[PDB]
Design a protein around this ligand. Sequence first.
Ligand SMILES: O=C1CCCC2=C1C1(CCCCC1)N=C(Nc1nc3ccccc3o1)N2
Ligand SMILES: OC[C@H]1O[C@@H](O)[C@H](O)[C@@H](O)[C@H]1O
Length: 388
Amino acid sequence: AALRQPQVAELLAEARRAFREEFGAEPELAVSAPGRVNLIGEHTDYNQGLVLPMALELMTVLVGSPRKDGLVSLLTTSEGADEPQRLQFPLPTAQRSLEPGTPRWANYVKGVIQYYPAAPLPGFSAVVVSSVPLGGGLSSSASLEVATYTFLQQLCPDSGTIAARAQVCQQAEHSFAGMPCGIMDQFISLMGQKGHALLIDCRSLETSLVPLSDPKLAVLITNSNVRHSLASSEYPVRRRQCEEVARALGAASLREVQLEELEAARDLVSKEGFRRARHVVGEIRRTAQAAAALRRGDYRAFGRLMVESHRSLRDDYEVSCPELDQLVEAALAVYGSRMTGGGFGGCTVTLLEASAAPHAMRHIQEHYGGTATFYLSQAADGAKVLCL
Ligand SMILES: O=C1CCCC2=C1C1(CCCCC1)N=C(Nc1nc3ccccc3o1)N2
Ligand SMILES: OC[C@H]1O[C@@H](O)[C@H](O)[C@@H](O)[C@H]1O
């Protein structure tokens, strides 16, 4: 109906024309980094827990060339970017360090350059494009962080690990966008592989690539086209009260605490507090079950754990919103459905039979009060490079 096609050949083609227009030469490099859907394991990554994301064909592309003048020149063409669409700045030095400011989309690139571990980092000219809906809950900011990082490696190869690069991109998000994210979005955008979900242990940083082949099974992502104020503001608050519980219970994280251990600890925590822990502590177990459900290829089954996720995010972690609750109702008539990412708006993810839709999308559009947009998501590759 209103399914947005990933248009990735078109997206690279656009970036290249805009580059040749803007800088008077053919760009030497293309990189991409995907946005992401989390299938299951919400608000667990910063509780040293488990997540089961996959990477999307929705991506951010940098096309660009090194410079010799030690300065960075950026053009973005992504419609929703705040103005101006261009920014230049000198590379940071021991004296001058990059600072967050205006425009906001540039803060992601600045952050990553500021924390890039390797040297010498030369200047560069780049066009930035993205088919990741900006602020839609599919990690537009992680795709731009990891796209930038991936471009910096072509200018000055790091001798790093996947985790060190994820932490760089994550620090850019903390310091330059004031968003105190865990490691999920960066990790999946680095490490995603076509036809696989990526089970991440956010305690050990051991990762599994779980085949998601079977073409009988689809993932429908539905953009609510809503972002509530509470989003930016309430994520840190949830994180802070996850620390208080861990503090009180002598646990270095909520990973190390067990549902039986917290049931017996109702006395020692807020009703807000216990409700947030029964989600996390719970929400870890079900991601482990889901993982072991995918592997066994039971796609009805971890419906339950997915719908169970949603209920718990909505009733216990209190980070759903009426729009998310009702896209779920609309779809859940499909193996399953739940909010995905940080919540207070953005997208749901629905695990249906490929054949089922586009009845899901006749029905969601015609039973969602807001504006639905759809992606039918193949599990995608992570960060990529194409020499031009
Ligand atoms: O305002 C917010 C708060 C919610 C989270 C968030 C945003 C904005 C910040 C900059 C203006 C647009 C919206 N952008 C992103 N991600 C992003 N990915 C991009 C890829 C290419 C170009 C620009 C990009 O911005 N995320
Ligand atoms: O599942 C909740 C997730 O929210 C994301 O939007 C954030 O970037 C992740 O680190 C994770 O905390």
